[PDB]
Amino acid sequence: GPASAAEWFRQRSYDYGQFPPEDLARRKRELGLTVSAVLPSRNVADTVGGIIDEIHALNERAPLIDQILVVDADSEDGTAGVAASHGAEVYSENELMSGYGDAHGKGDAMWRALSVTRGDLVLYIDADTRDFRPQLAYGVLGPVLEVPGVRFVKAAYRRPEEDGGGRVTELTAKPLFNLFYPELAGFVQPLAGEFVADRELFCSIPFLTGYAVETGIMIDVLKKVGLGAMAQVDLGERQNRHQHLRDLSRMSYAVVRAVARRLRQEGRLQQLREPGLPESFFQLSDYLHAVATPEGLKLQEYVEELVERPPINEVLRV
Amino acid sequence: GPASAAEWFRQRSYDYGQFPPEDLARRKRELGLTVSAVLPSRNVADTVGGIIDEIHALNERAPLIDQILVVDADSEDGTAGVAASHGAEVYSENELMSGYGDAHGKGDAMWRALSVTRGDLVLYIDADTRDFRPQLAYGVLGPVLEVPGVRFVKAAYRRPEEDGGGRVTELTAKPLFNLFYPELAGFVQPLAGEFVADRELFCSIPFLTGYAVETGIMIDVLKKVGLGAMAQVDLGERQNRHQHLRDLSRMSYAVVRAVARRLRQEGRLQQLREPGLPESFFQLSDYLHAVATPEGLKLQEYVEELVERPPINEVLR
Numbered sequence: 065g066p067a068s069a070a071e072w073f074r075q076r077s078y079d080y081g082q083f084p085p086e087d088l089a090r091r092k093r094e095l096g097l098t099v100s101a102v103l104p105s106r107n108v109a110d111t112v113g114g115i116i117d118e119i120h121a122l123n124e125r126a127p128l129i130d131q132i133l134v135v136d137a138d139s140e141d142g143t144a145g146v147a148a149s150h151g152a153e154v155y156s157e158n159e160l161m162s163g164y165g166d167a168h169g170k171g172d173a174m175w176r177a178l179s180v181t182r183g184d185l186v187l188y189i190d191a192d193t194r195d196f197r198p199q200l201a202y203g204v205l206g207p208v209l210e211v212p213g214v215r216f217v218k219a220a221y222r223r224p225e226e227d228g229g230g231r232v233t234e235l236t237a238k239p240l241f242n243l244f245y246p247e248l249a250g251f252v253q254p255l256a257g258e259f260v261a262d263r264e265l266f267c268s269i270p271f272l273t274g275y276a277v278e279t280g281i282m283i284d285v286l287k288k289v290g291l292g293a294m295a296q297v298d299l300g301e302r303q304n305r306h307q308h309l310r311d312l313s314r315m316s317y318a319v320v321r322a323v324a325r326r327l328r329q330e331g332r333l334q335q336l337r338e339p340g341l342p343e344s345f346f347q348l349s350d351y352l353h354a355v356a357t358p359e360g361l362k363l364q365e366y367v368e369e370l371v372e373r374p375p376i377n378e379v380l381r382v
Numbered sequence: 383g384p385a386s387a388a389e390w391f392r393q394r395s396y397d398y399g400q401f402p403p404e405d406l407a408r409r410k411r412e413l414g415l416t417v418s419a420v421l422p423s424r425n426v427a428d429t430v431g432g433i434i435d436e437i438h439a440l441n442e443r444a445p446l447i448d449q450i451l452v453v454d455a456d457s458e459d460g461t462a463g464v465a466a467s468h469g470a471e472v473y474s475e476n477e478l479m480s481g482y483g484d485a486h487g488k489g490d491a492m493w494r495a496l497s498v499t500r501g502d503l504v505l506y507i508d509a510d511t512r513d514f515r516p517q518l519a520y521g522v523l524g525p526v527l528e529v530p531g532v533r534f535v536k537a538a539y540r541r542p543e544e545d546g547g548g549r550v551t552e553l554t555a556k557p558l559f560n561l562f563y564p565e566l567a568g569f570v571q572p573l574a575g576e577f578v579a580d581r582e583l584f585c586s587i588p589f590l591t592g593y594a595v596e597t598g599i600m601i602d603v604l605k606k607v608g609l610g611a612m613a614q615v616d617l618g619e620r621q622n623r624h625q626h627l628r629d630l631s632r633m634s635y636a637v638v639r640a641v642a643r644r645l646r647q648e649g650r651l652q653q654l655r656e657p658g659l660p661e662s663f664f665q666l667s668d669y670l671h672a673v674a675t676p677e678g679l680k681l682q683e684y685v686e687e688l689v690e691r692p693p694i695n696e697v698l699r
């Protein structure tokens with residue numbers, strides 16, 4: 065493969081500039097591949113309509129996306145109606161794989177989407193992007209279509225001068241990756257919502273639910289296809305919606321848990337619970353967040369079970 | 383001890399308002415204890431003066447700090463001169479424990495200060511605070527003085543509703559503590575630079591050099607004296623710096639490195655290098671930071687070793 069993250073970063077980082085969409089459209093036509101775009105959507109009424117439009121506008125210049133799926137979290141904001149009125153196929157995350165009960169977050173929606181994706185290639189895109197430029201859809205298709213061994217491509221980009229990701233990327237994922245999965249240290253936006261791979265690949269790895277899904281997918285793909293078969297594409301600028309630091313804390317915990325879970329199955333981490341530690345202190349699903357408030361110090365408690373879905377291949381009608 | 387972070391939280395969180403300085407001064411005197419205040423300092427000529435001044439004013443009201451140590455990273459802004467001019471003792475981080483060579487960052491300075499601290503208690507204080515109110519000095523002394531079994535006290539506070547700390551604390555320390563050291567999850571500012579413990583405790587644990595020092599101390603104190611012997615005190619509002627996110631990434635890494643190390647030693651973590659990963663990818667002191675710029679993607683590469691100084695006890699006295 066590649067001797068280092070440095071070597072990979074050399075050979076496997078592209079620019080959307082290198083993949084004009086008419087070329088891709090042509091190449092895609094030649095290969096007879098179809099693409100499904102999947103938009104995990106939760107209260108994005110104000111933005112999905114615009115994204116669906118832009119993908120349609122792009123398909124006019126260059127036929128690249130055959131299916132547009134909005135997988136809705138039963139948003140209270142009318143998201144589903146909005147996406148439907150703009151021409152996307154819309155599904156409820158709770159109606160897909162209904163045998164699994166209600167969806168546990170973004171990861172669960174993304175997994176369940178596989179049950180109705182018809183494309184040879186599955187392309188995930190975030191539904192909340194404000195100013196959606198067309199390369200936020202087609203850029204990552206470049207290397208899958210054009211570079212021989214590449215099976216999985218993640219987006220790279222910058223906040224509208226040097227961007228190393230949002231807070232969770234910078235302070236959680238990158239430090240955890242550098243230490244535990246150094247092979248992934250080369251990725252500019254390892255937690256990006258926009259990335260693409262063949263449907264068969266996604267269908268044959270498990271999916272962490274909740275916010276841990278990207279982290280889990282990075283690790284699982286790395287292990288399945290190898291570093292040389294992953295790539296990234298600079299896509300330019302991408303405005304993302306800032307979250308409250310306090311909520312990001314919970315996301316950071318999900319990323320930690322995903323890494324910890326994987327380390328444990330590799331055997332690098334054993335006896336996760338330190339001996340001598342009374343069981344009462346031990347409950348992974350129980351996140352304690354101590355804060356200071358105008359009226360005193362408080363201990364907030366969040367409970368999120370780390371639910372993991374099996375490779376959908378194993379659980380879905382063949 | 384306590385049965386959960388929640389029980390600890392109710393029993394070992396206080397408000398500085400519970401500890402009027404004049405009462406602290408009385409108890410300190412009855413117990414014959416002395417307090418050393420260490421200010422690890424690098425380029426803070428603009429703020430040390432104020433801090434030192436506040437401490438001296440506090441002591442007039444209530445004699446609480448017996449020694450003020452500015453341990454200076456040989457700043458070029460004249461930190462040393464200001465501190466000296468304002469009445470504080472001044473030391474070069476490089477001259478203390480010089481057998482270990484020049485100093486590896488903030489932790490090293492804090493460790494080396496243990497060789498010149500005369501107090502029974504040692505109070506570390508950040509020297510870059512813009513608006514130093516009295517309770518930043520005395521608040522954390524409350525529980526060590528007043529609650530016999532308490533040996534270690536961390537500050538708690540909030541920026542100018544709910545505040546769960548700075549970016550590194552929220553996105554790195556607290557996630558990691560919740561998973562691997564649940565006993566520390568009740569701390570509001572576990573990475574706070576204001577904390578106090580008895581000299582003997584500090585002299586009995588190792589100190590990570592650099593940015594990981596607070597994380598290491600939290601963990602090693604926890605293992606050494608137990609969660610019951612730790613406390614926090616609400617000091618009110620403290621204004622915070624806006625370090626750059628790109629710099630904070632290296633800091634988060636140090637924090638992760640520190641936890642990982644402790645996990646290796648406990649046996650929880652082994653074969654840290656994936657069994658099948660070429661040594662070309664394996665260099666813990668080598669942090670790869672991939673970034674996007676106007677000119678394209680760049681892979682930045684920082685280096686900082688993790689250095690652990692042993693307990694000063696093993697080298698001294």
Ligand SMILES: Nc1nc2c(ncn2[C@@H]2O[C@H](COP(=O)(O)OP(=O)(O)O[C@H]3O[C@H](CO)[C@@H](O)[C@H](O)[C@@H]3O)[C@@H](O)[C@H]2O)c(=O)[nH]1
Pocket residue numbers: 104105106107108135136137157168169170173190191192232255256257258275276277278279304305307
């Ligand atoms: N169907 C569904 N969609 C969801 C859910 N939660 C979030 N989404 C959608 O998934 C997209 C991104 O989720 P964000 O909550 O906006 O994530 P982020 O703050 O932008 O942070 C980033 O890092 C995460 C780490 O994994 C990523 O998951 C995420 O994609 C994003 O890149 C958005 O379109 C959002 O509506 C859910 O529970 N169900």
Ligand SMILES: Nc1nc2c(ncn2[C@@H]2O[C@H](COP(=O)(O)OP(=O)(O)O)[C@@H](O)[C@H]2O)c(=O)[nH]1
Pocket residue numbers: 422423424425426453454455475486487488491507508509510575623625
């Ligand atoms: N003596 C010494 N002091 C330092 C060093 N680095 C930081 N400090 C001081 O430690 C305090 C906090 O520094 P810093 O780590 O930047 O604070 P933070 O970014 O808010 O966590 C300040 O008073 C700094 O001047 C160092 O290498 N040597």
Ligand SMILES: [Cl-]
Pocket residue numbers: 321324325348370
């Ligand atoms: Cl787990």
Ligand SMILES: [Cl-]
Pocket residue numbers: 348349368369370371
């Ligand atoms: Cl769980």
Ligand SMILES: [Mg+2]
Pocket residue numbers: 190192304305
């Ligand atoms: Mg977003």
Ligand SMILES: [Mg+2]
Pocket residue numbers: 345346347348349350351352560564
């Ligand atoms: Mg817990």
